[PDB]
Amino acid sequence: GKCRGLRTARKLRSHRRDQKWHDKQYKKAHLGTALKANPFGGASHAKGIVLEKVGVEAKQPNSAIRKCVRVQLIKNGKKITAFVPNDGCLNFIEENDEVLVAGFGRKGHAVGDIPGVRFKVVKVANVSLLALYKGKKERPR
């Protein structure tokens, strides 16, 4: 520290508060902007309705297409873009089918070579995608 007086606690406190406000994580966690602009709104999982299935491309050093869906939310109705994880699971998703989206790994940040997608799907038609992969459960009919 710099201020080393015996009767100095206030300058230390106010300077520590100001330099704590001059941060990124403490600025993010204590303002209403970073939660008001958050699509999940401080929630881990969310439900939604798929409207379109759009394949977005990869980044520079690798070449692929990435299978994604356009999901509108139920609680606030905004439009996000999810990402179906596994191989060949887009055939289980039909128009206007309810899904369960979740986080993608880096706390509201784009992960890997997929540009601009921060969410991924876990369950579709109120059954898990893993059980549809492993041949354990069947979609209701």
Next chain:
Amino acid sequence: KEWLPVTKLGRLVKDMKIKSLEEIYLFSLPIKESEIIDFFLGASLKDEVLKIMPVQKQTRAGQRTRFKAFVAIGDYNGHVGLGVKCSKEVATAIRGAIILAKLSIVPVRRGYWGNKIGKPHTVPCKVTGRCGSVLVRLIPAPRGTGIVSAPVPKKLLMMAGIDDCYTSARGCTATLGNFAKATFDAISKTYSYLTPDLWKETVFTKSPYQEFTDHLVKTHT
């Protein structure tokens, strides 16, 4: 496969007229022959690699890679050493590193934590070794605690014989060479710290050279 010394220290250890390496450490004589410590420290002197890293030199045609080898030497009841060597091949680098580490070995003393019971087990004071930006700080620890550190000063303190440590590091610890050299410097600086348990005036014991002038003239020119 015999030993032919080039310095008079090598001959004076070779003819069994130097009893131990302790007076070599006492009189601060430099060691230039690696078979003296092999003559003294035998089966308990074990070694292992720490990291092999490549470095590159840019030339006209392609890139030339030479391999740099780190190694640690030291028995489990005292002395410990370290050496760095770089060569074009790996076997030559590891042999030169083992020879240069065995050549340069420091002694270390051990202290107590509060109560002077039994054999000493920990560092007697707070020592600090620094090279580059790497800082390492050693704290005395109670008995039976175990070495808590990163894996490479844990290995170096096992080869130092000390089993009780509290460590604190600062800086770029990912550079293994500077971190190992800083911990080796922290170990080797434990004698340049005058505690009040040796404040008495020392008695000057007899130097080996003047004592065996007659044997040196009798053996070699």
Next chain:
Amino acid sequence: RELVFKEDGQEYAQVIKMLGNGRLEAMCFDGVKRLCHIRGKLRKKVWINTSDIILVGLRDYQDNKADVILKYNADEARSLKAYGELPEHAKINETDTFG
């Protein structure tokens, strides 16, 4: 080399104008303006000029974006014009590489 045709999933398109960003646009012979994308192995190994013949990959989840498969130079173009794969409103206009 070998004269491969369209299958279930491929059709034919005519490139019209040049665009950047690794994308370019074409009119398929069904009569829909599609935006195809250069897929991996045709980026800098081979070039694409104005008004050529392109095999086009389709989408099973949308119809707004297309893909690229191959390219035909002059003799493949007149060969597929010999059987008939395009409406006569579109014109090949003797597309080739200039001498």
Next chain:
Amino acid sequence: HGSLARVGKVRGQTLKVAKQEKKKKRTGRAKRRMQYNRRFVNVVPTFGKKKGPNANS
């Protein structure tokens, strides 16, 4: 071909083979007993670097 970016193409075209019928594996305490057995008390003093349990070169 069909098309380039088909979903489930490789796994759909992958040859389908089944499991091989085998006995059950020992679970619980005896799994650790066999692990300690094979790892420690059935060794020989070799030289050089040790070989991994999945080395099949």
Next chain:
Amino acid sequence: PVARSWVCRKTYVTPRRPFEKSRLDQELKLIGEYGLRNKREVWRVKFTLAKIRKAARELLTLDEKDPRRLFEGNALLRRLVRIGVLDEGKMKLDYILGLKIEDFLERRLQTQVFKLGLAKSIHHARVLIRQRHIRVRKQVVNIPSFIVRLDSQKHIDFSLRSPYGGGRPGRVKRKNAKKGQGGAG
């Protein structure tokens, strides 16, 4: 408001490094040597010894000639002597820090049955403890993690209702005798 307890705590701690060779080999060696089930038991014994060592260091921090230091030191020393991992000659507080985890694993009921001579192997000792064949002072024990005391080591013996210690024969012996009497008459 309901009348319950709501008091509980963990007895084991997970180490910070999940995958490195030496501590994994040391724990696996201890599991194989003392015939335990999983790493949670040796982590539990390490947690108990860590709490005992922390209490011993807290008592050794406080200066000599104090009432609470002498009281808690004599209480912990008497408990640690009576559990069987110390000796009356080593009746000092500064020798608590020198203990190792194998000393705590010595007084387990499984290895005590194995070392007394009531079972062939230590795994046979564990499947003897889990089987309810022995007793400790006219009362059977089923749990292999039964720590014993210095005065309780001598009194361990087979139970009354056991064919090994004299009693009713088991199910398979009675089934084979019934099969023999059926084949004979």
Next chain:
RNA sequence: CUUUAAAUCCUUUAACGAGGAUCCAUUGGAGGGCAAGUCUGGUGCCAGCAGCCGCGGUAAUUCCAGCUCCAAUAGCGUAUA
């Protein structure tokens, strides 16, 4: 039989109740971080894997399947504060 307002649960206890003791232990991985295959077959910058570096171009130590194995174990993995 015990317990309990009456039960039920636990314990005591008859007669039954296991050889591949089918009374059949899963969950995430096997390039580095970070314990553990340059094994075999298929696709060929396609499908996809990947928290990061990165892996796939018609010989993949990283994909899709089998065998071997590594970590915790009635538990393990993912997303969030």
